[PDB]
């Protein structure tokens, strides 16, 4: 099972079957055969395996990283503090990449699920994708194969200088 808030999904609404004709549809008979011959033995085997798994129980944990000071409060050419800040920045870079992956998966799921009316019913997913892609592009794009926290700090400083000049010339 997963968390239904990070991966949302609307409630399923299926119509009732109305046999207008008198011809028996083979799909109901095939579903009966599938439940008799396939679903029952697989369910029994999984029950046995889960019983074997419940005899001994051990846990694995999600690794927690405490926050260290970032590169903005590191002295220049101070390898210890800069090393810790660089490792933290790389971890957040990986997490941001997977956040963009999550939003992309949401968008693809909406496009497949809504059917032919996807252009109207997937407006919110498109807006979320556009916003998160704009944030990712403003944060991490055009850094090169040798990206580091200093490059990202320089890019953010240049963008902030451009924004300050733009708001000065528009004042």
């Amino acid at each position: 099972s997963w968390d239904k808030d990070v991966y949302p999904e609307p409630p399923r609404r299926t119509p009732a079957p109305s046999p207008q004709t008198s011809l028996p549809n083979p799909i109901t008979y095939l579903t009966k055969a599938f439940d008799l011959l396939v679903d029952r033995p697989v369910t029994l085997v999984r029950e046995f395996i889960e019983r074997q798994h419940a005899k001994n129980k051990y846990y694995y944990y999600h690794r927690e990283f405490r926050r260290v000071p970032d590169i903005t409060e590191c002295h220049e050419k101070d390898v210890l503090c800069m090393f810790e800040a660089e490792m933290q920045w790389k971890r957040d870079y990986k997490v941001d990449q997977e956040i963009v992956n999550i939003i992309q998966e949401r968008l693809k799921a909406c496009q497949q699920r809504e059917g032919e009316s996807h252009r109207q019913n997937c407006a919110k997913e498109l807006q979320q994708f556009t916003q998160v892609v704009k944030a990712y592009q403003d944060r991490y794009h055009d850094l090169g194969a040798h990206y580091s926290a200093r490059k990202c700090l320089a890019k953010q400083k240049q963008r902030m200088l451009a924004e300050r000049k733009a708001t000065k010339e528009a004042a």
């Binding site: 590169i71 903005t72 409060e73 590191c74 002295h75 220049e76 101070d78 055009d142 850094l143 090169g144 194969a145 200093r150 490059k151 700090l153 320089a154 890019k155 400083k157 240049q158």
Partner: protein
């Protein structure tokens, strides 16, 4: 370079100030490599005279290894002493001339400015 240092007490392999330093261990990796050099020279000495390389004259190979270890130990003692003297002179001159070695005003990255060159 250091002739003024090695000018008041000339032709001394190891001056009396060297005895304040820790001697190299007999398990020094450099000493072991020098012993391996001695063993290799013993094997070459067996080889050029058409003797069985790994069997003939074990006393000769033992004397080769022993001589190399002895000379290498004393050379290592001198090398460690001379690097110690280098560091001692460097630190004394740094401390004696504070005007020429000022403390650099270190600044954090929130104040420094670096130009950004995009890779596109």
């Amino acid at each position: 370079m250091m002739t003024g240092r090695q000018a008041r007490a000339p032709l001394q392999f190891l001056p009396d100030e060297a005895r304040s330093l820790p001697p190299p261990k007999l398990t020094d990796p450099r000493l072991a490599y020098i012993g391996f050099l001695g063993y290799c020279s013993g094997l070459i000495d067996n080889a050029i005279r058409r003797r069985p390389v790994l069997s003939a004259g074990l006393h000769r190979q033992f004397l080769y290894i022993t001589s190399f270890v002895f000379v290498g130990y004393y050379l290592l003692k001198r090398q460690d002493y001379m690097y110690a003297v280098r560091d001692h002179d460097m630190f004394s001159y740094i401390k004696s001339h504070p005007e020429d070695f000022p403390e650099k005003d270190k600044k954090t990255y929130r104040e420094v400015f670096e130009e950004f060159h995009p890779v596109r």
